[PDB]
Design a protein around this ligand. Structure first.
Ligand SMILES: *[C@@H]1O[C@H](CO)[C@@H](O[C@@H]2O[C@H](CO)[C@@H](O[C@@H]3O[C@H](CO)[C@@H](O)[C@H](O[C@H]4O[C@H](CO)[C@@H](O)[C@H](O)[C@@H]4O)[C@@H]3O)[C@H](O)[C@H]2NC(C)=O)[C@H](O)[C@H]1NC(C)=O
Ligand SMILES: *[C@@H]1O[C@H](CO)[C@@H](O[C@@H]2O[C@H](CO)[C@@H](O[C@@H]3O[C@H](CO)[C@@H](O)[C@H](O[C@H]4O[C@H](CO)[C@@H](O)[C@H](O)[C@@H]4O)[C@@H]3O)[C@H](O)[C@H]2NC(C)=O)[C@H](O)[C@H]1NC(C)=O
Ligand SMILES: *[C@@H]1O[C@H](CO)[C@@H](O[C@@H]2O[C@H](CO)[C@@H](O)[C@H](O)[C@H]2NC(C)=O)[C@H](O)[C@H]1NC(C)=O
Ligand SMILES: *[C@@H]1O[C@H](CO)[C@@H](O)[C@H](O)[C@H]1NC(C)=O
Ligand SMILES: *[C@@H]1O[C@H](CO)[C@@H](O)[C@H](O)[C@H]1NC(C)=O
Ligand SMILES: *[C@@H]1O[C@H](CO)[C@@H](O)[C@H](O)[C@H]1NC(C)=O
Ligand SMILES: OC[C@H]1N[C@H](CO)[C@@H](O)[C@H]1O
Ligand SMILES: OC[C@H]1N[C@H](CO)[C@@H](O)[C@H]1O
Lengths: 392, 390
């Protein structure tokens, strides 16, 4: 989408995975979807270093709406859970130097059952723009026809443009097409800043594996369409929650960097371990994700329960991730000729290699004929950065 | 098995899950299966508080043997990886105040391909006793008949008894029988101190879940036969390794305590986090596992992606575990009438409840009319101890 936005993958926080559709503010006040939750999250995004690391968008997902539209036919926030309304919440978020994202659905209802946007694309777009919204996530539930889906996503893109406000447009169009037909990613790119391809993530290693395996299986189809202004979205980062071991969290961070994924955390910033915070705020890995060249990485090889992925970076640099998919035993040694990496360009005539994950450590100079030797933990990843050099 | 051993579930360390069958001592001298590995673990079991916490058995799994028997037909340890031999390793382990476990197979080969014990049961038992072995894990690979399987496990049990040495006897008899015929656990208990029921564990939450689900599904068959001298073995603790989140490690520790399981760590004692070490050495949770009454717990209910398990303890106390099996979202509240717990006796007329996991905290007095409310992390467990006030 040519709106000048998302020139690097968008970074922020999204409530869905950790908080879902919890409407019980009497019995579960700390977990229900309410304006107080988002205000506190904004405060912590500032005070705990998230904004500095680059996480800019505070995003509301489903279940913010009142059961029905108002007298003028416009959407309204829930009166009990959002008494002061979206405009005042946007003012607060902007006052913290952050941007506000919101959610809607292409069909007649949202996935959770709240008012959909069909028939209201231009007025809903104008409502969001008046409220000060900076990002829209557009879901695809309750729409069982491809023509309606496509026209909806295109229409809402054009309506957002016509409002005149800069709004990141996040689509679930490809995901909802697959039951019917393979998506045309050139068209989707034309209309969207990023697009969900695959099933929702949850707080499990099984889910991470399923997303990685789907991405590598389909990589001929999706890797080259990604770039500044339009990204593949493999769904939220779940680091800092409950279901991933430390090595599995490292794997998710490393591979979302390789994949040029939007980095939308879905966690509770009020209750997050120092280790999880340090990984999510890791300057070098974020710098890989945000690389200005904007070329998505890919799976280079797979075998013997190992995977090697790599991503080209600006200035003849490359990032390389090595995953150990064997879920028994101990760290396994993996060796590869550096000439096999980075299309044979990374280490010609030499490269300096720095390990970034699981720990940062300079590995030294490797000649084009050299071999790289590493040990990789079960379900963990080693992430390396290769800098081309003629020194040595 | 009435040998006077395993009066509480056996606790120790076993190499298999973390170190497997690594024979490459040229490139990986520090992780290959060798006498140096077991010496290093024994040293740390003493120096890092494991023995004090109760972990007593240092166990060799498969891949210790030389490719073939010696001239006199006896098993021998690999000459390169175990140059001083098993008897000398046992002497060292005993000098540290620990006990030594070893591995053999009822059939013609071990699962990894080394000499099996079929045709050699009495000589193998006498060899182990002469070496000073204190525990035998007896695998079931390469056994071509259910009759040979049963006869082997029984014969080896009797041969061990006849050596006169106290040797904990760990069997895989049920596991290898189940695909073909339902096991008779009264018989197995007659011959074994503990028995493997289900597929090998690995370093994953999927494995933990499958073991718990198999145990609860079969619990009418296996819970009541367990007790002092004979335990269900759901396989090793994998806490301290790579595949489990903190909450999943808590779930494994809590549920292995509820199930009166043997506690065999399989990890690297040289590289273990402070948190994992503190969980594995948790005095209150180990005391639940080691409760002298020896009554195995069971799943009380399941629904709404929650499970409740409970275990009766000595002195009118009960342990209660609540698992959140929903793998999305945040801590989820679960409430239950305390009158529903402990068969209606735990909190009649009242009980004092202490949370042990994930953190220790006294919760207070609960009347027979009360309801217990907790928030349980996804894939985590809350473990409680209930003390009747009378
Ligand atoms: C509504 O849709 C229209 C298109 O239908 C869209 O107009 C496009 O806007 C972008 C960005 O505002 C324009 O791209 C710019 O073009 C100028 C020269 O024409 C360049 O100087 C710009 O380069 C800067 O920004 C680049 C990144 O965007 C950087 O790479 C560079 O370093 C510069 O800093 C940039 O290329 C594009 O030309 C128009 N296209 C048309 C057909 O008008 C409009 O913005 C949309 N409006 C809203 C509110 O969404
Ligand atoms: C070979 O098999 C035989 C037959 O099963 C087996 O003999 C059994 O040994 C156990 C343990 O030594 C005996 O159980 C003991 O029985 C006597 C009764 O006179 C009791 O004094 C013992 O007291 C136990 O409990 C005490 C407190 O409660 C403890 O302080 C004490 O240490 C004891 O553990 C206990 O009840 C069992 O009676 C015999 N059975 C027979 C038929 O003799 C023998 O141990 C096996 N040998 C080997 C080497 O495996
Ligand atoms: C399961 O095995 C046990 C032991 O092999 C059987 O129990 C014995 O049964 C014999 C008669 O068949 C009795 O004389 C013994 O007293 C029993 N032993 C014990 C310890 O009770 C049992 O019958 C078998 N069950 C089935 C269903 O075959
Ligand atoms: C919403 O429902 C109306 C009435 O049933 C229907 O005409 C319309 O097609 C639906 N919207 C979509 C996007 O399918
Ligand atoms: C994809 O859409 C673009 C733009 O609408 C179009 O030009 C192209 O023909 C489509 N691709 C295929 C393979 O039909
Ligand atoms: C071991 O092999 C022999 C010879 O093939 C066979 O007769 C015997 O039954 C086997 N034993 C077992 C337990 O499989
Ligand atoms: O109801 C909201 C949910 N519907 C989408 C399905 O992909 C999820 O991402 C989340 O937004
Ligand atoms: O070869 C050794 C392996 N065989 C057993 C099969 O259950 C495992 O526990 C482990 O001991």
């Amino acid at each position: 989408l040519d709106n000048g936005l998302a020139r690097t993958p968008t970074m922020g926080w999204l409530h869905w995975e950790r908080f879902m559709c919890n409407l019980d503010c009497q019995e579960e006040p700390d977990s229900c979807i309410s304006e107080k939750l988002f205000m506190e999250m904004a405060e912590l995004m500032v005070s705990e270093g998230w904004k500095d690391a680059g996480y800019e968008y505070l995003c509301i997902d489903d279940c913010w709406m009142a059961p029905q539209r108002d007298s003028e036919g416009r959407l309204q926030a829930d009166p009990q859970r959002f008494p002061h309304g979206i405009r005042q919440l946007a003012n607060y978020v902007h006052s913290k130097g952050l941007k506000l994202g919101i959610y809607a659905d292409v069909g007649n209802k949202t996935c959770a059952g709240f008012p959909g946007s069909f028939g209201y694309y231009d007025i809903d777009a104008q409502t969001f723009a008046d409220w000060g919204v900076d990002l829209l996530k557009f879901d695809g539930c309750y729409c069982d026809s491809l023509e309606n889906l496509a026209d909806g996503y295109k229409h809402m893109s054009l309506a957002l443009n016509r409002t005149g406000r800069s709004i990141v447009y996040s689509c679930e169009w490809p995901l909802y097409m697959w039951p019917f037909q393979k998506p045309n990613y050139t068209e989707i790119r034309q209309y969207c800043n990023h697009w969900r391809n695959f099933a929702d993530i949850d707080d499990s290693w099984k889910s991470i594996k399923s997303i990685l395996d789907w991405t590598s299986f389909n990589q001929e189809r999706i890797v080259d369409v990604a770039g500044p202004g339009g990204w593949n979205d493999p769904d939220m980062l779940v680091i800092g929650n409950f279901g991933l071991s430390w090595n599995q969290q490292v794997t998710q961070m490393a591979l979302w960097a390789i994949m040029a994924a939007p980095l939308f955390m879905s966690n509770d910033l009020r209750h997050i371990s120092p280790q999880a915070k340090a990984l999510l705020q890791d300057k070098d890995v974020i710098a890989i994700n945000q690389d200005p060249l904007g070329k998505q990485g890919y799976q280079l090889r797979q075998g013997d329960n190992f995977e090697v992925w790599e991503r080209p970076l600006s200035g003849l640099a490359w990032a390389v991730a090595m995953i150990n998919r064997q879920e028994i035993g101990g760290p396994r040694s993996y060796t590869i000729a550096v000439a096999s990496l980075g299309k044979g360009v990374a280490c010609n005539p030499a490269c300096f290699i720095t390990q970034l994950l699981p720990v940062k450590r300079k590995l030294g100079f490797y000649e084009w004929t050299s071999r790289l030797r590493s040990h990789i933990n079960p379900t963990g990843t080693v992430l390396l950065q290769l800098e081309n050099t003629m020194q040595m």
